């Protein structure tokens, strides 16, 4: 009832949506630490970027690339800042918690 391109587009969209929700949920659901939370947020940004680029190719328009670059910039900046804050907290709270950095326990 459909062509191969329909297969590829549907697969792209479903995979991107599943990636989005997996990056949203799994880190907190599996009870990892803050570093994994930042990494999953990075994955969410990557999935949104993939969707944006797919849409831009679907339109042959330029907005998707601008969105891509801005998402990359913001995600990297926030991840670096969060890592710095996390290291500061690690040093500050080390003597009394050990399991400080896992707030999902």
């Amino acid at each position: 009832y459909y062509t191969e391109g329909e297969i590829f587009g549907t697969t792209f969209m479903y995979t991107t949506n599943m990636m989005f929700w997996a990056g949203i949920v799994g880190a907190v659901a599996f009870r990892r630490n803050l570093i994994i939370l930042l990494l999953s947020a990075e994955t969410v940004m990557l999935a949104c970027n993939m969707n944006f680029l797919f849409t831009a190719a679907y339109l042959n328009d330029i907005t998707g690339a601008i969105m891509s670059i801005t998402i990359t910039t913001i995600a990297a900046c926030e991840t670096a800042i969060g890592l710095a804050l996390c290291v500061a907290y690690f040093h500050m709270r080390s003597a009394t918690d050990v399991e400080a950095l896992n707030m999902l326990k």
Partner: protein, 134 residues
């Protein structure tokens, strides 16, 4: 990849063309210009070679079991890695500008970007952030 519409095949009908594309030879001058395809096959071949070279000494070398044989004989990194992150993002920003025939106002805006960049970088310089005593 194989074409799935006559429009993709430039409205050329027939069965010979479909099978021809199915078992075609890779050609940069054919249907796959700028394909990046040999990278994957290179990855497969290198994986095979490295795995084989890992396996082989486990076959042609005598083995003896010893307890003691199975034993091994900072923020500056934070600063450097985060600076590398930001500066590589800035380099990625700069790269398209180098690939175009930009105009004078485009040049001035690029210089504005670079001015903000070097302003932050020089502030870090003047505050002792580039002296790696620690």
């Amino acid at each position: 990849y194989n074409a799935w519409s006559p429009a993709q095949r430039y409205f050329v009908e027939g069965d010979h063309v479909v099978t021809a594309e199915a078992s075609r030879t890779f050609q940069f001058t054919g249907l796959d210009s700028g394909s990046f395809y040999p990278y994957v096959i290179a990855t497969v071949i290198a994986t095979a070679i490295s795995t084989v070279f890992i396996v082989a000494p486990l076959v042609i070398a005598p083995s003896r079991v010893d307890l003691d044989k199975s034993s091994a004989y900072s923020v500056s990194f934070y600063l450097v890695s985060i600076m590398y992150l930001l500066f590589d993002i800035e380099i990625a920003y700069l790269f398209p500008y180098a690939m175009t025939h930009a105009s004078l106002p485009m040049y001035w805006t690029m210089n504005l970007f670079l001015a903000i960049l070097v302003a932050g970088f020089a502030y870090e310089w003047g505050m002792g952030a580039l002296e790696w005593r620690e």
